[PDB]
Design an enzyme around this catalytic site. Structure first.
Site, short mmCIF file in Angstrom:
data_model
loop_
_atom_site.label_atom_id
_atom_site.label_comp_id
_atom_site.label_asym_id
_atom_site.label_seq_id
_atom_site.Cartn_x
_atom_site.Cartn_y
_atom_site.Cartn_z
N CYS A 104 80.75 -7.95 20.85
CA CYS A 104 80.04 -6.88 20.18
C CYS A 104 78.63 -6.86 20.77
O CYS A 104 78.01 -7.91 20.89
CB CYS A 104 80.11 -7.06 18.67
SG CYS A 104 78.64 -6.56 17.75
N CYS A 127 35.36 -28.98 53.48
CA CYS A 127 35.90 -29.88 54.48
C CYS A 127 35.59 -31.32 54.10
O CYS A 127 34.48 -31.62 53.66
CB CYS A 127 35.36 -29.56 55.87
SG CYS A 127 36.29 -30.31 57.22
N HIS A 130 44.26 -34.32 53.67
CA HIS A 130 43.22 -33.72 52.87
C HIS A 130 42.07 -33.27 53.77
O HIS A 130 40.92 -33.59 53.53
CB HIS A 130 42.78 -34.68 51.77
CG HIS A 130 42.45 -36.04 52.27
ND1 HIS A 130 43.32 -37.06 51.94
CD2 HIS A 130 41.50 -36.59 53.06
CE1 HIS A 130 42.87 -38.18 52.47
NE2 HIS A 130 41.78 -37.92 53.16
N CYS A 133 53.45 -27.20 32.15
CA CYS A 133 53.32 -25.96 31.41
C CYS A 133 53.66 -24.76 32.30
O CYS A 133 54.05 -23.72 31.77
CB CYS A 133 51.92 -25.81 30.82
SG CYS A 133 51.53 -26.97 29.49
N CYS A 185 84.17 -12.77 33.44
CA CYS A 185 84.76 -13.95 32.83
C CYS A 185 85.68 -13.61 31.66
O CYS A 185 86.22 -14.52 31.04
CB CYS A 185 83.66 -14.91 32.40
SG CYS A 185 82.56 -14.20 31.14
N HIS A 243 84.18 -8.74 16.98
CA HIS A 243 84.67 -8.71 15.61
C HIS A 243 85.00 -7.26 15.33
O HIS A 243 84.25 -6.38 15.76
CB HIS A 243 83.59 -9.30 14.70
CG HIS A 243 82.23 -8.79 15.04
ND1 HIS A 243 82.00 -7.44 14.84
CD2 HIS A 243 81.10 -9.29 15.56
CE1 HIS A 243 80.77 -7.15 15.22
NE2 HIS A 243 80.21 -8.24 15.67
ZN LIG Z 1 78.58 -8.17 16.09
ZN LIG Z 2 80.92 -12.67 31.72
ZN LIG Z 3 49.80 -28.26 30.39
ZN LIG Z 4 40.51 -39.53 53.62
#
Ligand SMILES: [Zn+2]
Ligand SMILES: [Zn+2]
Ligand SMILES: [Zn+2]
Ligand SMILES: [Zn+2]
Ligand SMILES: [Ba+2]
Ligand SMILES: [Zn+2]
Ligand SMILES: [Zn+2]
Ligand SMILES: [Zn+2]
Ligand SMILES: [Zn+2]
Length: 305
Positions: free
Chosen positions: A220, A271, A301, A123, A215, A228
């Site tokens: 528009c 710890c 860890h 997420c 490019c 157009h």
């Molecule tokens: Zn347009």
């Molecule tokens: Zn471009």
């Molecule tokens: Zn999630």
């Molecule tokens: Zn451990």
């Protein structure tokens, strides 16, 4: 690895987020010869300089400050090939549900809002992706562009921006353009709609036609097609996805028997290095692994959040 408390961004050869290994050294000689009085218990202990002290065991060195660093853990690395610690990322060892998908995942990202909201890495990715496409990043002078907690909590901007390396090279690159694009937009300019280009352009604001001369794309501006000549977070979820929220009882308890003597032991901070309180035992062991303490557990860890 039996257990990973840390995650880094490995610039290569992983070019991705990986479980990281913790290292410590005298901040004077830069040797692997600092004995700490006391091991780290939280991210501050390893992220704030000279916060932690020991004795540097070199015969003829007087340094007493530690310097912590991290390495990718997915493969060998030289004594000091450093990776950036993604300190918001945590192993979800208490099975907390995610604020947005509500599944139990691991690892998770924990915002530094007061509520310490929890979101899974899937997420987080999507959150980042969405907020790009929708120009929904937030600016801050001393940072640039970042994101807050997904729940809308203040002072929750991500400061360590390498956390956006969770997006993969391209999404990440979009992210690095973002300020520059924003500049153009904020001056009534426009971005090239051609996929893969997205270059910055500033026509006169009363021109419906815009050519990318990039490019070549004429388009528009009102409708972003080629030119157009015609006309054209749930409340419960938040409450539940809190790092410090009161939880059920998992497999892994919060009292565990000493591996030697078997007397129940409370753990009283971050710890993972335990010292059995019993006067007649005094075993040093890892809380998680149930075994004598050692440099692997230190590496993997030394502490947990
Ligand atoms: Zn347009
Ligand atoms: Zn471009
Ligand atoms: Zn999630
Ligand atoms: Zn451990
Ligand atoms: Ba037509
Ligand atoms: Zn790596
Ligand atoms: Zn030293
Ligand atoms: Zn929050
Ligand atoms: Zn014991």
């Amino acid at each position: 690895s039996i257990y990973n408390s840390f995650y880094v961004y490995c610039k290569g050869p992983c070019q991705r987020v990986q479980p990281g290994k913790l290292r410590v050294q005298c901040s004077t000689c830069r040797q692997a010869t600092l004995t700490l009085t006391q091991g780290p218990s939280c991210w501050d202990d390893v992220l704030i300089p000279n916060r932690m002290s020991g004795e540097c065991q070199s015969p003829h060195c007087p340094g007493t400050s530690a310097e912590f660093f991290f390495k990718c853990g997915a493969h060998p690395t030289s004594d000091k090939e450093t990776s950036v610690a993604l300190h918001l990322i945590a192993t979800n060892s208490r099975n907390i549900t995610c604020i947005t998908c509500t599944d139990v995942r691991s690892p998770v990202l924990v915002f530094q809002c007061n509520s310490r909201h929890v979101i899974c890495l899937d997420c987080f990715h999507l959150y980042c992706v969405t907020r790009l496409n929708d120009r929904q990043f937030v600016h801050d002078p001393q940072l640039g562009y970042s994101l807050p907690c997904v729940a809308g909590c203040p002072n929750s901007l991500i400061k360590e921006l390498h956390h956006f390396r969770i997006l993969g090279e391209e999404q990440y690159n979009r992210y690095q353009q973002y300020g520059a694009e924003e500049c153009v937009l904020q001056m009534g300019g426009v971005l090239c709609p051609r996929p893969g280009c997205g270059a910055g352009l500033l026509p006169e604001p009363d021109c419906r036609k815009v050519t990318c001369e990039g490019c070549g794309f004429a388009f528009c501006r009102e409708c972003k097609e080629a030119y157009h000549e015609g006309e054209c977070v749930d409340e419960r979820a938040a409450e539940q996805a809190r790092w410090e929220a009161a939880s059920k009882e998992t497999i892994k308890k919060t009292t565990k028997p000493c591996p030697r003597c078997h007397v129940p032991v409370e753990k009283n901070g971050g710890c993972m290095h335990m010292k059995c309180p019993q006067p007649q035992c005094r075993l040093e062991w890892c809380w998680n692994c149930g075994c004598e303490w050692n440099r692997v557990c230190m590496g993997d860890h030394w502490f947990d959040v």
